Amino acid sequence: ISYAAYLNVAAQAIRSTELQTASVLNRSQTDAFYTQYKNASEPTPITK
Amino acid sequence: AEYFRDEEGQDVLLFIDNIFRFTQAGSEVSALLGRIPSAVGYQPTLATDMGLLQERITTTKKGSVTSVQAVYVPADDLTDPAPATTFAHLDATTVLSRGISELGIYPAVDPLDSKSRLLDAAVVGQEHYDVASKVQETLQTYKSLQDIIAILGMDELSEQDKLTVERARKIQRFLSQPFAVAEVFTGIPGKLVRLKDTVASFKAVLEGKYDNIPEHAFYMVGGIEDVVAKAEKLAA
Amino acid sequence: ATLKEVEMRLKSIKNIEKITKTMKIVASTRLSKAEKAKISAKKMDEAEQLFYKNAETKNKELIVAITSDKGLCGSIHSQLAKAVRRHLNDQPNADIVTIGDKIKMQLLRTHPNNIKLSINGIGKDAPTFQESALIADKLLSVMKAGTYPKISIFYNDPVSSLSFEPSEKPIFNAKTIEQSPSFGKFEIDTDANVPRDLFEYTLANQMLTAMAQGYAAEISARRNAMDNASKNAGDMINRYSILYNRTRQAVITNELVDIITGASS
């Protein structure tokens, strides 16, 4: 758990407060896949 | 020609310019003669007259006559019936295109519209044929990507393709050979390059050996050695 | 025929024009949001830099680069790729982390050796702290960022609103914080592991800024490029229009001649 991952989780939690905006929700919802690569082969894409 | 071919029995040469005029002349008289005009207006006896003429030019066992025939294509439409039926009777053709003339390449021979029955991997051997195969493929790719090139930049083509495109642009420029008869017009002293030399020169270019120097270096100059030197000239 | 093949091809060109038009406009809309983000991000970055500058910022390595999954953003993808290749001559065998596919592919061609981590699923969205945070967290764990004595990040700085110059900057390692005379310009006790915390925090904050600069450059380039496309397509409309007109006339003439020939008999 990186310090900024800790802060990130806190930020997401903080919009849960009652009052909300779409950009906030977008800032609290994103997806990706981090893919490893070798010195070649790509270990299977794992969702970020 | 026949007197030389037959009676003297010594190999000749023959030049005909234009054999479109032969067809054309026939079409003019045809109307007056009273023939129902065939398509485009050509004489109905177009096929026979051309046929007879082109079989009176031939290599018999009596003698061998190299002939050079020049076809004025009207409006440069090859689909016109008189040029079309000419294409049938020739043994090799090297159609020269106005577009390639606009590109400034003199000689202006279209490189995807040339044929000879002498281009074979037996006749000029596998190595020559292989060299030619790659040239054809490269240029055809370049022609294929002409649409894409115009609509969007060349940078928006695939990297692999960009190598091909760069090579082909070089091949296109490379193909110009200054002619000594055109020395006046070009203003560049002509150069004749050996057949053995030609195969070598293209082989190297195809392997991208000398691909590292400008397109302008390849432009309006002779053989590979000349290109190398012309890079030095430009470099100064 | 001639006539129909001209017409269908001209229709294609017309449709292409319409699409390139559509994209160019939509690009402008999208671009507005992008620019707004880039300002806010850059301001945030300036605060971190305030520390590093005042501190004295004096420094296998890491290379990180960013170019979206999607292409057709002009030569954003390949100008940055080319600028990676030059500084990957410089580096012996540095590990390239490629954030988004387009640069990943190009770099993969240049070396498959150096590519160790890559991302995918970033470009379609505008960058957000969430993305950056997760990317940073995975960067630390997977690549063990501290091993690299120097990190460098590559992005496209949107130099002018019609230009983009591919740009790089150096992310400062925890070592940097340690050996900078930042004790002489700031105060921490020792209980906090300010190097290990600040390194992590600015790993992401610097990356997010880079992503914002990049995203803006991508969308800006896409607008510029698609605009130039529209121009090129227009010219082709005119060229095929002349062909169409000539072809139409020719068809009338050729058909007419056949009719005359029949009538004459």
From Swiss-Prot, chain A:
Alphabetized GO MF terms: proton-transporting ATP synthase activity, rotational mechanism
Keywords recorded for this protein, A-Z: ATP synthesis, CF(1), Hydrogen ion transport, Ion transport, Membrane, Mitochondrion, Mitochondrion inner membrane, Phosphoprotein, Transport
InterPro entries cross-referenced by the UniProt entry: ATP_synth_F1_esu_mt, ATP_synth_F1_esu_sf_mt
Pfam families: ATP-synt_Eps (PF04627)
Domain of life of the native organism: Eukaryota
Chief site of localization: mitochondrion
Biological process terms in GO annotation: proton motive force-driven ATP synthesis; proton motive force-driven mitochondrial ATP synthesis
Record text on subunit structure and interactions: F-type ATPases have 2 components, CF(1) - the catalytic core - and CF(0) - the membrane proton channel. CF(1) has five subunits: alpha(3), beta(3), gamma(1), delta(1), epsilon(1). CF(0) has three main subunits: a, b and c.
Family: Belongs to the eukaryotic ATPase epsilon family.
PANTHER family the UniProt entry points to: ATP SYNTHASE EPSILON CHAIN, MITOCHONDRIAL, ATP SYNTHASE SUBUNIT EPSILON, MITOCHONDRIAL
Record's protein name: ATP synthase subunit epsilon, mitochondrial
Organism the protein comes from: Saccharomyces cerevisiae (strain ATCC 204508 / S288c)
Swiss-Prot record, chain B:
Subunit structure: F-type ATPases have 2 components, CF(1) - the catalytic core - and CF(0) - the membrane proton channel. CF(1) has five subunits: alpha(3), beta(3), gamma(1), delta(1), epsilon(1). CF(0) has three main subunits: a, b and c.
Organism: Saccharomyces cerevisiae (strain ATCC 204508 / S288c) (Baker's yeast)
Protein name: ATP synthase subunit beta, mitochondrial
Location of Phosphoserine modifications: S101
Chain segments annotated as coiled-coil in the UniProt record: none
Family: Belongs to the ATPase alpha/beta chains family.
Compartments, as annotated in UniProt: Mitochondrion; Mitochondrion inner membrane
Further details from the record: Present with 164000 molecules/cell in log phase SD medium.
Full protein stretch here: 273 to 508 of 511
Record function comment: Mitochondrial membrane ATP synthase (F(1)F(0) ATP synthase or Complex V) produces ATP from ADP in the presence of a proton gradient across the membrane which is generated by electron transport complexes of the respiratory chain. F-type ATPases consist of two structural domains, F(1) - containing the extramembraneous catalytic core, and F(0) - containing the membrane proton channel, linked together by a central stalk and a peripheral stalk. During catalysis, ATP synthesis in the catalytic domain of F(1) is coupled via a rotary mechanism of the central stalk subunits to proton translocation.
Curated annotation (Swiss-Prot), chain C:
GO CC term, one of those recorded: mitochondrial inner membrane
Gene3D superfamilies xref list: 3.40.1380.10
Example GO molecular function: proton-transporting ATP synthase activity, rotational mechanism
PROSITE patterns xrefs: ATPASE_GAMMA
Family per similarity comment: Belongs to the ATPase gamma chain family.
The protein's name: ATP synthase subunit gamma, mitochondrial
Recorded topology in the membrane: Peripheral membrane protein
Keywords per UniProt: ATP synthesis, CF(1), Hydrogen ion transport, Ion transport, Membrane, Mitochondrion, Mitochondrion inner membrane, Transit peptide, Transport
PANTHER family: ATP SYNTHASE GAMMA CHAIN (PTHR11693), ATP SYNTHASE SUBUNIT GAMMA, MITOCHONDRIAL (PTHR11693:SF22)
Subcellular location: Mitochondrion; Mitochondrion inner membrane
Subunit structure: F-type ATPases have 2 components, CF(1) - the catalytic core - and CF(0) - the membrane proton channel. CF(1) has five subunits: alpha(3), beta(3), gamma(1), delta(1), epsilon(1). CF(0) has three main subunits: a, b and c.
Effect of S264F: In allele ATP3a
GO BP annotation list: proton motive force-driven ATP synthesis
Keyword presence, Hydrolase: no
InterPro entries found in the cross-reference section: ATP_synth_F1_ATPase_gsu, ATP_synth_F1_gsu, ATP_synth_F1_gsu_CS
Keyword Phosphoprotein annotated: no
Note: Present with 28100 molecules/cell in log phase SD medium.
Biological function: Mitochondrial membrane ATP synthase (F(1)F(0) ATP synthase or Complex V) produces ATP from ADP in the presence of a proton gradient across the membrane which is generated by electron transport complexes of the respiratory chain. F-type ATPases consist of two structural domains, F(1) - containing the extramembraneous catalytic core, and F(0) - containing the membrane proton channel, linked together by a central stalk and a peripheral stalk. During catalysis, ATP synthesis in the catalytic domain of F(1) is coupled via a rotary mechanism of the central stalk subunits to proton translocation.
